[PDB]
Amino acid sequence: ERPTFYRQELNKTIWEVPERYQNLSPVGSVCAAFDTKTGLRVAVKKLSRPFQSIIHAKRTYRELRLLKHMKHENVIGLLDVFTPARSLEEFNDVYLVTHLMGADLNNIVKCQKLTDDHVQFLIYQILRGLKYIHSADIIHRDLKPSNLAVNEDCELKILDFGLATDDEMTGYVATRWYRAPEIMLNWMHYNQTVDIWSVGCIMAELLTGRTLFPGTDHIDQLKLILRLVGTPGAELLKKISSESARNYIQSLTQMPKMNFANVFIGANPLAVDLLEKMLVLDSDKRITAAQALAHAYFAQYHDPDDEPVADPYDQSFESRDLLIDEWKSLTYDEVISFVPPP
Numbered sequence: 034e035r036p037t038f039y040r041q042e043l044n045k046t047i048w049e050v051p052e053r054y055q056n057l058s059p060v061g062s063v064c065a066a067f068d069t070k071t072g073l074r075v076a077v078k079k080l081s082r083p084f085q086s087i088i089h090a091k092r093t094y095r096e097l098r099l100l101k102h103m104k105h106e107n108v109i110g111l112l113d114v115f116t117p118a119r120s121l122e123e124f125n126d127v128y129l130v131t132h133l134m135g136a137d138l139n140n141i142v143k144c145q146k147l148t149d150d151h152v153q154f155l156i157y158q159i160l161r162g163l164k165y166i167h168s169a170d171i172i173h174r175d176l177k178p179s180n181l182a183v184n185e186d187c188e189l190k191i192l193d194f195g196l197a198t199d200d201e202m203t204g205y206v207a208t209r210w211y212r213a214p215e216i217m218l219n220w221m222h223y224n225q226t227v228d229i230w231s232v233g234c235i236m237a238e239l240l241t242g243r244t245l246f247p248g249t250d251h252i253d254q255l256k257l258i259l260r261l262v263g264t265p266g267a268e269l270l271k272k273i274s275s276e277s278a279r280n281y282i283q284s285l286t287q288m289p290k291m292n293f294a295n296v297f298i299g300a301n302p303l304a305v306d307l308l309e310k311m312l313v314l315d316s317d318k319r320i321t322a323a324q325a326l327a328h329a330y331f332a333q334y335h336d337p338d339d340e341p342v343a344d345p346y347d348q349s350f351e352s353r354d355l356l357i358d359e360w361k362s363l364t365y366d367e368v369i370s371f372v373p374p375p
């Protein structure tokens with residue numbers, strides 16, 4: 034087998050790709066391109082210094098393994114992964130190819146009170162993708178509009194899992210406005226429902242057209258949050274397994290859950306109901322992706338025979354220490370073993 038690769042310097046970096054891919058244009062390192070073999074326009078990603086270190090060697094493996102496992106209409110998939118190397122001895126580049134989408138929610142919603150029919154179609158897709166993700170016991174951890182690719186047909190694909198800092202999460206920034214508090218403030222080892230909280234921020238935003246919890250810092254955000262959803266009761270308190278977090282919450286002057294119908298004025302009661310059930314402090318009691326696809330709000334889009342689960346994902350590599358070379362070989366095995374879809 035083996036196709037023929039060709040060079041082109043593209044904004045500071047050399048990309049060497051199979052002939053099939055043509056008309057590469059910059060974007061971010063990512064490129065738009067056109068895949069002659071299949072007729073699909075696609076996004077292409079080159080991992081910078083994929084095996085620079087142990088943290089990085091593991092990271093590339095984690096990413097490639099994740100992209101390799103994901104097969105679903107609402108989750109970022111791999112049409113192709115390749116290296117121009119001819120052996121492990123000079124293997125040093127990974128190019129990850131996916132469908133081209135073209136924008137994300139930010140570049141389409143953005144201070145923009147959408148129609149109820151839209152907001153349903155967007156969240157249904159998130160949740161369908163999330164039912165599939167959560168079914169392989171994978172968590173995303175960092176859901177937010179920028180990690181949701183939308184094409185001009187309102188078709189959503191979930192992107193960029195939380196594979197990996199303190200400065201990138203500080204002050205008035207969207208890097209932190211969608212995070213469940215239990216993880217913003219490291220309260221406990223956290224379930225997968227952390228994602229459902231993020232969907233609830235996103236949803237509120239799409240209807241209201243304004244950031245739900247746009248806190249100026251971690252503690253201002255917690256304050257904005259508790260105000261909307263109540264301060265925690267003694268039951269949740271026991272679960273927060275971090276004496277300093279508990280103590281601080283205990284300091285907070287108690288207050289009750291606000292009425293959402295009055296926060297989301299003129300919003301469809303079904304949506305308000307859903308939000309009520311997503312934005313819950315006790316991660317244990319939130320609605321799941323599965324259960325939410327069965328909610329009335331998505332009755333026009335719910336199809337329990339077209340809401341696939343996944344195969345199981347063996348992530349036991351995570352709790353496993355290895356050398357650069359051993360991660361890179363595990364990575365190489367993954368690249369050369371790849372099979373494309375129909």
Ligand SMILES: [O-][n+]1ccc2c(-c3ccc(F)cc3F)cc(C3CCNCC3)nc2c1-c1c(Cl)cccc1Cl
Binds near residue numbers: 076129130181182183
């Ligand atoms: O459609 N599309 C498809 C895939 C991506 C990817 C992307 C993710 C995994 C992969 F193996 C290959 C990729 F190209 C990474 C980014 C990165 C772009 C900058 N921000 C982080 C993700 N953007 C896109 C996009 C995209 C988006 Cl979501 C908005 C605008 C333009 C593009 Cl081409």
